[PDB]
Ligand binder design. Structure first.
Ligand SMILES: C[S@@+](CC[C@H](N)C(=O)[O-])C[C@H]1O[C@@H](n2cnc3c(N)ncnc32)[C@H](O)[C@@H]1O
Length: 364
């Protein structure tokens, strides 16, 4: 079976690693390709089917997609792949021609093998790039092609709202994909604990990426500009053994973080402090790790300069930070005795953000 596994652009490798460890626990053979056909935010998983012997002494199949939906913290969607292909030049094609290519391609796929045509279906589409067609166009054409093909085998019923089966069709640049979305209408990053919605909140998948990149070892973890508490809540939900501390400047957001942490059942796991990170050394003397989604915003250069001056007084091991302001953070890091030991770019809410892992230059 082939699966398309989606995640944030720029963390594909971290997601592959998580999925690999999860599947290794099942005992199955598998291969994972990062960025199939060049497309960011995707993995292509090729796995053996997961068989066991059930209470009747019969071979029975375990659902790989349910296992991954239930256990992954880095993935957005788990989609059973029907087909992925390059439609070379489709960005330039006129509307009529582009849709024709898509309809003809889909008409050729054995979709009747991925739905009991008693079941209701709908088509969800996603489009990204410069096309002469829209999401709506794609969903209609694909929807038409699948209804027509299914009608060759039975009587198919659409249900747009509560389909039993969602076919997801995505066109990103030159690349077309069709699959069965096992995840459903809410992506895996939607957390039911998020009762307070901070307007610059970090998606949970990227929070977990930052945690993985810190390489935590049970030492104390501070988010000194914590907002609604996402990073610390995801960490407590990992049953982290170590101390967890959040500091946030504005009351409203700090109370939002408390409410989110209560909703998640981990309020007892986190110390939440209202405070100023440019004064960090007043609130703590020593922390092992700092992990923060910094404000993206002048005033930024000076906020970062003072914060990294204070962080230098208290940090023992590593910091992991995300920001849009590459130049401000890079200067604050260099002026304050820090060294960058990893950098990458991540796609977050249609922004390119920069992630850095840092340590103090003098620590060996
Ligand atoms: C991008 S948001 C954090 C969002 C958090 N990752 C979440 O998911 O909710 C940056 C936060 O830094 C806080 N902040 C700004 N200046 C601060 C300062 N001097 N001290 C502490 N927090 C500050 C803001 O109030 C804001 O909540």
């Amino acid at each position: 079976m082939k699966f398309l596994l989606t995640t944030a652009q720029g963390i594909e490798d971290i997601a592959k690693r998580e999925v690999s460890l999860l599947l290794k626990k099942l005992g199955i053979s598998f291969q994972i390709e990062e960025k199939p056909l060049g497309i960011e935010g995707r993995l292509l998983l090729e796995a053996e089917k997961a068989y066991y012997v059930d209470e009747k002494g019969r071979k029975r199949e375990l659902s790989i997609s349910t296992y991954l939906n239930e256990n992954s913290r880095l993935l957005h969607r788990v989609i059973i792949e029907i087909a992925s292909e390059k439609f070379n030049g489709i960005e330039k094609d006129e509307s009529e021609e582009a849709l024709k290519r898509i309809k003809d391609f889909v008409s050729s796929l054995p979709v009747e093998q991925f739905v009991k045509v008693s079941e209701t279906f709908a088509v969800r589409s996603f489009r990204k790039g410069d096309h002469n067609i829209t999401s709506i166009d794609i969903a209609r054409t694909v929807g038409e092609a699948i209804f027509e093909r299914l009608s060759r085998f039975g009587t198919p019923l659409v249900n747009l709202d509560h389909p039993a089966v969602i076919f997801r069709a995505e066109l990103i640049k030159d690349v077309f994909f069709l699959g069965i979305d096992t995840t459903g209408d809410s992506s895996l990053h939607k957390r039911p604990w998020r009762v307070y919605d901070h307007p610059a909140h970090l998606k949970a998948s990227i929070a977990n990426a930052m945690i993985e990149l810190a390489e935590l070892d049970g030492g104390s973890v501070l988010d000194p500009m914590c907002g609604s508490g996402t990073i610390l809540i995801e960490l407590a939900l990992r049953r982290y053994s170590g101390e967890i501390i959040g500091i946030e400047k504005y009351r409203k957001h700090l109370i939002g973080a408390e409410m989110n942490a209560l909703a998640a059942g981990v309020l007892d796991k986190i110390k939440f402090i209202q405070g100023d990170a440019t004064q960090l050394s007043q609130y703590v003397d020593s922390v092992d790790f700092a992990i923060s989604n910094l404000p993206y915003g002048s005033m930024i250069p000076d906020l970062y300069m003072k914060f990294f001056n204070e962080l230098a007084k208290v940090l023992e091991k590593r910091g992991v930070f995300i920001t849009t302001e590459k130049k401000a953070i890079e200067e604050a890091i260099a002026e304050n005795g820090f060294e960058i030991i990893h950098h990458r770019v991540i796609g977050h809410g249609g922004l390119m953000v920069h992630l850095y892992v840092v340590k103090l230059e003098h620590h060996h």
